[PDB]
Design a protein around this ligand. Structure first.
Ligand SMILES: Nc1nc2c(ncn2[C@@H]2O[C@H](COP(=O)(O)OP(=O)(O)OP(=O)(O)O)[C@@H](O)[C@H]2O)c(=O)[nH]1
Ligand SMILES: [Mg+2]
Length: 169
């Protein structure tokens, strides 16, 4: 059994908890339970491999920003979540991406860009800008909805495959 330390990051209210709870409970929360820090240990089969996922569901509220350095040190890969239809000029994705690079003193930390809430009205330009951002950064982009489950397994499993690749290199 192979272990993977995944961390879900992003601004408050973007859907980190809803994505995690879709994966582990097969349920859409349809409720905002603002996070401090929750940690899950889950045995999941990915590509036929039995995986132990240690998933840290982190706080996006700015009042909890001091907790970031600790979870960035321990995390092996990061889901960087934003609301596709409210990308805020990528400001939060850029800050989390830089903080991860600085804390881990590494330019190639496993990372997936997750554009969540794609069930809500979304402009073509915002979907295309997200795809071009991910291409510029050399990381995958996955469009998700915690409401419909679109993309949820793809986001988490893509991050696990990137950690596999990083380890094999
Ligand atoms: N329509 C829709 N609502 C969503 C989706 N994901 C989350 N929500 C809702 O958005 C709100 C915030 O979701 P959470 O997952 O709690 O947000 P979070 O990113 O964990 O927030 P913090 O823990 O405070 O950082 C809740 O009311 C969710 O039901 C989604 O894909 N679509
Ligand atoms: Mg949360």
């Amino acid at each position: 059994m192979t272990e993977y330390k995944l961390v879900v990051v992003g601004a408050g209210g973007v859907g980190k908890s809803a994505l995690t709870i879709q994966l582990i409970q097969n349920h859409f929360v349809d409720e905002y339970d603002p996070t401090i820090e929750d940690s899950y240990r889950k045995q999941v089969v990915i590509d036929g491999e039995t995986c132990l996922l240690d998933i840290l569901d982190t706080a996006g509220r700015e009042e909890y920003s001091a907790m970031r350095d600790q979870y960035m040190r321990t995390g092996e890969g990061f889901l960087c979540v934003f609301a596709i239809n409210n990308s805020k000029d990528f400001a939060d994705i850029n800050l989390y991406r830089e903080q991860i690079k600085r804390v881990k003193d590494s330019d190639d930390v496993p990372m997936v860009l997750v554009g969540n809430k794609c069930d809500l009205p979304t402009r073509t330009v915002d979907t295309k800008q997200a795809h071009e951002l991910a291409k510029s950064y050399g990381i995958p982009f996955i469009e998700t909805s915690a409401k419909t489950r679109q993309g949820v397994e793809d986001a988490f499993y893509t991050l696990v495959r990137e950690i596999r690749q990083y380890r094999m290199k």
